[PDB]
Amino acid sequence: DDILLAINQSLRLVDSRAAMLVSQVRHGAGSLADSYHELIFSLRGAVRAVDDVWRPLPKDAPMRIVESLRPFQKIPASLRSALKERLDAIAERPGGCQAVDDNNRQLGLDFDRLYWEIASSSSFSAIHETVSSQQKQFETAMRELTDEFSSRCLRRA
Ligand SMILES: [Cl-]
């Protein structure tokens, strides 16, 4: 129970911090980079919690993990939409495009690591194909918005 609770609370914290990031992009007056950093470190803390499994988990664990992973699928589109709104304002700030680009790239890597940690865990083998499928689709979307934002921001800059 406590291992599984730590895992799922960590995944819920990731979704909370992602909503906080999307809000900061849309409504923020830097503080934006802080929001990306906090999301990154929530992902890292989820990796740590997944890696702390040392003992088989109960038979309801893989379905609870699937439920906690489900909201992640909506993150790239929400972030993409917010970034499109603020693109021109971000491009106006010296080094703005490059700071967002660097954070988008890192955020994609930290999500992919967390997905892979779950997908490749022997304690989560019963959902390996589902988690791997979600991982790849997250990656595709996360890459497309990263490359789209970078190319459009450079030009508006
Ligand atoms: Cl839980």
What is the residue-wise DSSP string for 62-116? HHHHHHHHGGGGGHHHHHHHHHHHHHHHHHHSTTHHHHHHHHHHHHHHHHHHHHH
The tally of domains found in the chain comes to 1
Q: How far is the CA of 69 from the centre of ligand 1 (A)?
A: 12
Amino acid in position 27: H
> Which domain does 72 fall in, by range?
2-156
Q: How far is the CA of 141 from the centre of ligand 1 (A)?
A: 27
Enumerate residues preceding breaks in the chain (C to N > 2.5 Å). 29
Alpha-carbon gap, residue 40 to 47, rounded angstroms: 11
Alpha-carbon gap, residue 39 to 53, rounded angstroms: 22
Alpha-carbon gap, residue 36 to 14, rounded angstroms: 11
Q: How far is the CA of 4 from the centre of ligand 1 (A)?
A: 6
Q: How far is the CA of 78 from the centre of ligand 1 (A)?
A: 25
Q: What are phi and psi of 53, to 5 degrees?
A: -60, 125
Q: What is the DSSP secondary structure assignment for residue 120, as one 8-state letter?
A: T
What does each C-alpha distance from 15 to 18, 56, 96, 122, 157 come to in angstroms? 5, 26, 25, 24, 31
Q: How far is the CA of 21 from the centre of ligand 1 (A)?
A: 23
Nearest Cα to Cα of residue 114 among 13, 35, 1: 13
Asked whether the beta carbons of 86 and 148 are under 8 A apart, the reply is: no
**Tokens standing for 32?**
């934006």
Alpha-carbon gap, residue 150 to 116, rounded angstroms: 26
Q: How far is the CA of 105 from the centre of ligand 1 (A)?
A: 30
Asked whether the beta carbons of 23 and 52 are under 8 A apart, the reply is: no
What does each C-alpha distance from 45 to 19, 21, 85, 111, 119 come to in angstroms? 17, 17, 30, 11, 17
Q: How far is the CA of 1 from the centre of ligand 1 (A)?
A: 8
Asked whether the beta carbons of 46 and 114 are under 8 A apart, the reply is: yes
SS3 29: coil
How many Cβ atoms are within 10 Å of 29's Cβ, its own excluded? 6
Q: How far is the CA of 115 from the centre of ligand 1 (A)?
A: 18
Asked whether the beta carbons of 7 and 46 are under 8 A apart, the reply is: yes
Alpha-carbon gap, residue 14 to 16, rounded angstroms: 5
Amino acid in position 121: S
Helix (H) or strand (E) holding 135: helix 128-156
Give the resolution value in Å: 1.5
Nearest Cα to Cα of residue 109 among 146, 78, 148: 146
Q: How far is the CA of 66 from the centre of ligand 1 (A)?
A: 11
Q: Angle at Cα 142 formed by Cα 133 and Cα 89, nearest 5°?
A: 165
Class of residue 1 by CB neighbours under 10 A (exposed 0-12, middle 13-18, buried 19+): exposed
Nearest Cα to Cα of residue 107 among 7, 21, 8: 21
Q: How far is the CA of 75 from the centre of ligand 1 (A)?
A: 21
